[PDB]
Amino acid sequence: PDLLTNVAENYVNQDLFAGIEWRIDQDGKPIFQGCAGVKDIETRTFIPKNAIYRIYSMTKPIVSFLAMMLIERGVFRLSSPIQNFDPRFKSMKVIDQHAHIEPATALITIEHLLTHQAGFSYDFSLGCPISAHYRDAQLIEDGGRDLTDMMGVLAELPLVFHPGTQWKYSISTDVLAHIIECATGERVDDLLQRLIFDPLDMQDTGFSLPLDGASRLMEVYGMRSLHGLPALKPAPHVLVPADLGSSHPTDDPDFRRGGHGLYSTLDDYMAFANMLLSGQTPEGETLLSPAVLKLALAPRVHFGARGMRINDEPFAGYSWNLLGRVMTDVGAAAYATHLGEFGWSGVAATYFWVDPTKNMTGCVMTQFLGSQHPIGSDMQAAAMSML
């Protein structure tokens, strides 16, 4: 039966999500799709055609893919030290949980940024030795700050381990977007437009709403913590509209980031996901050669018995490649999948996957910040059970 509809309708009928859309493609054509709920519970307006979602860290596979294209074109290489493009990242320091600070003993490379092994942290990282200083600097909160300037502020702060020696999910994709700009002399949003969005016909994807976009933007629900102080336990899961402060502008022509900030649609993101099965547009144009796509997807960071964790949340059986998660042990997995399934997700509960063993892609779009309910994994599992 249609387990995907069941999952989505149950979430809407339990007042856990306002509105959900999903699509599963196989061999580049839709095989399951649906929608549940509404654009916003306040007016119960129906989900519009080509509804728009804040995809947060589903920005990261796109920016990472751009970096792989630029590696293929010779702009830089995985081993390139980022200080060669921005000397503000020369002479980094490292801080630990015992207040000890010392010089970094390795240079940060492009590969370190793509694997979150550079030693950067994130503003909302609970218990982190440096996240308090990120929050004081408002690195994430101040979305009106130009990327180039935010990077100058970040560069003055210490790392939390020596580059290459550990893994911690981080602001490093934003550093990557910035280093792309340094290396090319172009803006990351223009490069994304020319190299990825326009060839794949992702006309609704970008760091600002399209002209007719305000009426299609889905409402975002959830509770962002006071002052950005990382919470010690989950807030109650309640459909209250979320206040984004100045972190996620809708119409700032200079807003651009590497780790979040894109708006997109279900249809646009599926075009990107389907492309990742081959590296080609549907017309057959190559965005990334098979050899470099294989380089990008191969498991690259392997985890100990604790596994891959973000703020202590597990990604069971997943390793990390240059674009995001990749399933490397079905026997350790916590929900239905196949070896080699890859993809990523965002904090407003958007989720996608690519499953090469089934020539399958899937994406769930919704807007709930810090959900206590893993809707993305639930929908993936339903789709796996159906195919």
Q: Which residues of 194-225 are buried (b: 16+ CB within 10 A; e: fewer)?
A: ebbbebbebebbbbbbbeebeebbbbbbbbbe
Torsion of CA 305, 95, 154, 312, to 10 degrees: 30
Among residues 224, 256, 300, 325, the one that binds ligand 9KF under rule CB under 6 A: 224
CA–CA gap between residue 74 and residue 216 (Å, rounded): 39
343 binds, among ligand 9KF, a copy of itself, none (CB under 5 to 8 A by kind): none
CA–CA gap between residue 123 and residue 274 (Å, rounded): 32
The backbone torsions φ and ψ at residue 134, rounded to the nearest 5 degrees and listed phi first, read -60, -45
CA–CA gap between residue 122 and residue 228 (Å, rounded): 11
245 binds, among a copy of itself, ligand 9KF, none (CB under 5 to 8 A by kind): none
CA–CA gap between residue 19 and residue 143 (Å, rounded): 26
Q: How many residues comprise the chain?
A: 387
Strands 29-37 and 318-321: unpaired
CA 175 remoteness from chain centre: 14
Local structure of 61: helix, strand or coil: helix
Beta-ladder partners of 21: 35, 365
Q: Which two tokens stand for residue 226?
A: 């006071």
370 binds, among a copy of itself, ligand 9KF, none (CB under 5 to 8 A by kind): ligand 9KF
260 binds, among ligand 9KF, a copy of itself, none (CB under 5 to 8 A by kind): ligand 9KF
Q: Which two tokens stand for residue 233?
A: 């336990």
Distance in Å, CB of 91 to a copy of itself, minimum: 8
Contacts with a copy of itself in 95-154 (CB under 8 A)? 102-106
295 binds, among a copy of itself, ligand 9KF, none (CB under 5 to 8 A by kind): none
Select 85 or 368, whichever has its Cβ closest to ligand 9KF. 368
145 binds, among a copy of itself, ligand 9KF, none (CB under 5 to 8 A by kind): none
Contact 335, 380 (CB under 8 A): yes
57 binds, among a copy of itself, ligand 9KF, none (CB under 5 to 8 A by kind): ligand 9KF
Of 311, 365, 290, 387, nearest to 58 by C-alpha is: 365
Select 6 or 105, whichever has its Cβ closest to a copy of itself. 105
| CA dist list (Å): 165 to 61, 120, 162, 361 | 23, 12, 6, 33
Distance in Å, CB of 100 to a copy of itself, minimum: 9
Among residues 11, 53, 85, 124, the one that binds ligand 9KF under rule CB under 6 A: 124
Contact 136, 227 (CB under 8 A): no
Distance in Å, CB of 166 to a copy of itself, minimum: 16
Contact letters for ligand 9KF, residues 54-83 (x by CB under 6 A): --xx--------------------------
Distance in Å, CB of 140 to ligand 9KF, minimum: 5
Question: Is residue 150 near ligand 9KF by the rule CB under 6 A?
Answer: no
Distance in Å, CB of 129 to a copy of itself, minimum: 16
Contacts with ligand 9KF in 233-262 (CB under 6 A)? 247, 259-260
105 binds, among ligand 9KF, a copy of itself, none (CB under 5 to 8 A by kind): a copy of itself
Neighbours of 302 (CB within 10 A): 10
369 binds, among ligand 9KF, a copy of itself, none (CB under 5 to 8 A by kind): ligand 9KF
Number of residues engaging ligand 9KF in binding (CB under 6 A): 12
Contact 76, 112 (CB under 8 A): no
Distance in Å, CB of 138 to ligand 9KF, minimum: 11
- Positions that interact with ligand 9KF (CB under 6 A): 56-57, 124, 140, 224, 247, 259-260, 346-347, 369-370
- Positions that interact with a copy of itself (CB under 8 A): 102-106
